[PDB]
Design a protein around this ligand. Sequence first.
Ligand SMILES: CCS(=O)(=O)N1CCC(C(=O)O)CC1
Ligand SMILES: CCS(=O)(=O)N1CCC(C(=O)O)CC1
Ligand SMILES: [Zn+2]
Length: 138
Amino acid sequence: SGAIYVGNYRVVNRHLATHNDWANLVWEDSSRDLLVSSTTAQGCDTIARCDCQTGVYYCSSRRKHYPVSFSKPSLIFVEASEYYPARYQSHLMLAVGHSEPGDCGGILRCQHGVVGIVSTGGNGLVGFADVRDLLWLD
Ligand SMILES: CCS(=O)(=O)N1CCC(C(=O)O)CC1
Ligand SMILES: CCS(=O)(=O)N1CCC(C(=O)O)CC1
Ligand SMILES: [Zn+2]
């Protein structure tokens, strides 16, 4: 689980959004696994405006931060897991790293701030939903 809090926006995995997230929907994209909802309280997170392909992500299933190399955002076919079926996902970044069910909403970040959140795992890979193209967030 986990979210980004920037200005008056909460960014979450679409498949983990709550009834409140949908009651305060700003934007959602089923192809990206993203949803943004409005918050009343100001968030502290800064979104990276960069094309970094290295950073650190938080892995709650190991309670560790891992440094990773990741691919640039692209359309990727996502393998079926124990709990979710297989599907295509846009704006997805892969790295070699640990991600299992529960790890979603872990934040990937670089010097310039938040790059994305964990969205996929399996097969010794972690997939991250990029948020850097969403300039309206900052
Ligand atoms: C590990 C691949 S997955 O498709 O099973 N999946 C990713 C993490 C998600 C979450 O923690 O919400 C749900 C589970
Ligand atoms: C790249 C991983 S990071 O985002 O956790 N971190 C390292 C880059 C910054 C620096 O070392 O100048 C500080 C922030
Ligand atoms: Zn960066």
